Design a protein around this ligand. Structure first.
Ligand SMILES: CN(C)c1cccc2c(S(=O)(=O)N[C@@H](CCCNC(=N)N)C(=O)O)cccc12
Ligand SMILES: CN(C)c1cccc2c(S(=O)(=O)N[C@@H](CCCNC(=N)N)C(=O)O)cccc12
Ligand SMILES: CCCCCCCCCCCCCC(=O)O
Ligand SMILES: CCCCCCCCCCCCCC(=O)O
Ligand SMILES: CCCCCCCCCCCCCC(=O)O
Ligand SMILES: CCCCCCCCCCCCCC(=O)O
Ligand SMILES: CCCCCCCCCCCCCC(=O)O
Ligand SMILES: CCCCCCCCCCCCCC(=O)O
Length: 582
């Protein structure tokens, strides 16, 4: 109303307000120390309480961007510490805010945040819960200037919970550690997905984004009408554009509106928004965005009616190509919550191509009549890979399943670095253990979501150090063809094996004391290097060495004079193996 800070203060609450202001400042002034930001927060909070009291008090009328900018320009060491950015303070709003956005460092040169010992961690938490959580909130926020603030706040509260439950536990570590690792990945995944959607919106444009949304929104709100889905898709697009531009406030307002709009028309969108809509202003958005798919209508016509038979296909299609295709997408997506969004896009793409070729032919109907048949092979491809890979994972464990993927890809792309291969394969394996446990109907969507992030990470590392044209093709290809492209890679015939290296296969007793995580990465690293040396080795030849090795270790780690065993038997292993693998 009259006062913006007052309004936000009232909605959000004191605690949330103070946390968000902190995150916001940490995201711009990434270089200032924790104690400086805390001061800022206090002053902004105090000022806020002043306005809550008297809406007409000094400055309370000024907009949030203006207020935020002024306080930002208050920092005396602004130029000394941030140089160029200080020139932003000379500009008027909105150039000022705009200027600040352009100077936000997407990834500064800060030190990796290390995880302390669980005990020091639980004691710090206990002795000063607030400064312990806020300082870490600060460290995370400054390292991820683009992470949507409210969401970072959502994570914080889960972290708080993990410490309460675990620092009380008998075995604190057994409780805490795994919850922490889970929190980290979930954080890594959210981060990666946010930057991924933004990248895509930049490269492939609005249209492509819109398409992806119709599909996703349709699977989620199958009982909504195409007109509502269009509405939502338009607003969602605006939201992402702005949220991607990086302006927290604008992004927040857009999201608030959309969430409240959805809740008001809740009855005509989805029957699973009841809970989400009764939640606090700060959680509405987050909830809705993650809502389970609603139940789809039972009395739903067959597609071929309006899209294959009907002689108005080309008529309706030429009258508004994108709308018609959007309708096709809507119709197909809502009957298939079990398809990955990108699979749906491939079908829509296929349908479009057909109509382009066909509607330009004498007898349209005859030309495009056998299209739903062209879909079959498209749908089955992803399904087959799922059942096939999920079975294999059920046999061997995650670990053993990770090794198979290790051999499989080292062969396809031997140029890639051994460490990169180990990491990608490990994360790929995890997708197997996180998705294969769901009933079929949810597998593909799961794989898509986890595969998309892992594939982007893969492409990035490669952007930096290009090592293969094939990998770069897949990486730059259509986002809808990214995964298929990687799936179509075959063994590298050209590759010339790395010259043998003794050190690379020498193992010491230190291997017996390392943690599982460590031992595995140690073994998996030799494996990639093994394959990189003998790429023509068969499943049989390999399993042989591995079995020998397997024993080797266990044997030399349960016998006196370790380092002797590994050195004496080690020579034997390598000697025999070099021979078996000719
Ligand atoms: C919940 N969310 C916001 C996160 C919590 C903790 C760590 C996160 C990280 S992380 O990078 O610190 N943690 C990962 C990635 C290593 C990258 N390190 C860099 N210095 N770049 C890790 O420790 O294996 C990234 C993204 C989100 C995170
Ligand atoms: C709450 N309003 C404003 C929404 C915001 C963002 C995404 C929404 C979606 S969605 O389908 O795009 N939801 C996305 C994930 C949301 C982003 N989540 C993050 N943690 N970053 C998806 O399922 O692929 C559906 C409905 C409402 C949404
Ligand atoms: C969200 C802010 C609270 C985070 C506090 C947890 C401390 C551990 C984070 C270290 C990151 C990691 O390596 O997992
Ligand atoms: C100056 C203070 C800036 C903090 C304002 C953030 C408002 C949060 C709105 C929640 C939006 C959403 O539902 O995602
Ligand atoms: C009005 C609704 C807009 C939806 C537009 C339908 C376009 C679907 C065709 C599929 C295109 C695949 C996406 C791409 O890679 O370009
Ligand atoms: C490893 C886990 C199995 C992954 C199977 C790949 C299927 C990819 C589905 C996404 C897509 O439609 O491209
Ligand atoms: C570098 C290694 C290439 C990564 C390939 C991952 C693609 C996963 C899809 C599964 C498959 O078809 O193999
Ligand atoms: C030509 C040198 C061959 C010797 C190298 C042996 C390295 C193989 C690594 C074994 C990894 C199998 C994983 C496991 O033991 O569970």
């Amino acid at each position: 109303h009259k006062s913006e800070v007052a309004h936000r203060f009232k909605d959000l609450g004191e605690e949330n307000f103070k946390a968000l202001v902190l995150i916001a400042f940490a995201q711009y002034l990434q270089q200032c120390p924790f104690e400086d930001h805390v001061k800022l927060v206090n002053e902004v909070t105090e000022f806020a309480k002043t306005c809550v009291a008297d809406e007409s008090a000094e400055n309370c009328d000024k907009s949030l961007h203006t207020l935020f900018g002024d306080k930002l320009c208050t920092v005396a060491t602004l130029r000394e510490t941030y140089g160029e950015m200080a020139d932003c303070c000379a500009k008027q709003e909105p150039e000022r805010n705009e200027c600040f956005l352009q100077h936000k460092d997407d990834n500064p040169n800060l030190p990796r945040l290390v995880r302390p010992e669980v005990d020091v961690m639980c004691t710090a938490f206990h002795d000063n819960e607030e400064t312990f959580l806020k300082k870490y909130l600060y460290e995370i926020a400054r390292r991820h200037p683009y992470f949507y603030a409210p969401e970072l706040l959502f994570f914080a509260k889960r972290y708080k919970a993990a410490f309460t439950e675990c620092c009380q536990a008998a075995d604190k570590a057994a409780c805490l550690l795994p919850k922490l690792d889970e929190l980290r990945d979930e954080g890594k995944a959210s981060s990666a997905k946010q930057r991924l959607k933004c990248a895509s919106l930049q490269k492939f444009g609005e249209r492509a984004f819109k398409a992806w949304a119709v599909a996703r929104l349709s699977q989620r709100f199958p009982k909504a009408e195409f007109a509502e889905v269009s509405k939502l898709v338009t607003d969602l697009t605006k939201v992402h554009t702005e949220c991607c531009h990086g302006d927290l406030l604008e992004c927040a307002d857009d999201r608030a509106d959309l969430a409240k709009y959805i809740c008001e028309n809740q009855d005509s969108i989805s029957s699973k928004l009841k809970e989400c809509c009764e939640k606090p202003l700060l959680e509405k958005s987050h909830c809705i965005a993650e809502v389970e798919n609603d139940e789809m209508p039972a009395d739903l016509p067959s597609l071929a009616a309006d899209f294959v038979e009907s002689k108005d296909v080309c008529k309706n299609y030429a009258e508004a190509k994108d709308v018609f295709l959007g309708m096709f997408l809507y119709e197909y997506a809502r009957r298939h919550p079990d398809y990955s969004v990108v699979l749906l896009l491939r079908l829509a793409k296929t349908y479009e191509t057909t109509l382009e070729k066909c509607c330009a032919a004498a007898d349209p109907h005859e030309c495009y009549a056998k299209v739903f048949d062209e879909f079959k092979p498209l749908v089955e491809e992803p399904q087959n890979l799922i059942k096939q890979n999920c079975e294999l994972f059920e046999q061997l464990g995650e670990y053993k399943f990770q090794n198979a993927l290790l051999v499989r890809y080292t062969k396809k792309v031997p140029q890639v670095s051994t460490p990169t291969l180990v990491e990608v394969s490990r994360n790929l394996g995890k997708v197997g253990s996180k998705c294969c446990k769901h009933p079929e109907a949810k597998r593909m969507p799961c794989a898509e979501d986890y595969l998309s992030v892992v594939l982007n990470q893969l492409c990035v590392l490669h952007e930096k150090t290009p090592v293969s044209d094939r990998v770069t093709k897949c990486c730059t290809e259509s986002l809808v063809n990214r995964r298929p492209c990687f799936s179509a890679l075959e063994v590298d015939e050209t590759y010339v094996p790395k010259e043998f290296n003794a050190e690379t296969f020498t193992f010491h007793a230190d291997i017996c004391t390392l943690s599982e995580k460590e031992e595995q990465i140690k073994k998996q690293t030799a494996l990639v290097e093994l394959v990189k040396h003998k790429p023509k080795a068969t499943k049989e030849q390999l399993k042989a060495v591995m079995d020998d090795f397997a024993a080797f270790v266990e044997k030399c780690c349960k016998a006196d004079d370790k380092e002797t065993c590994f050195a004496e038997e080690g020579k034997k292993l390598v000697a025999a193996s070099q021979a078996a693998l000719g």
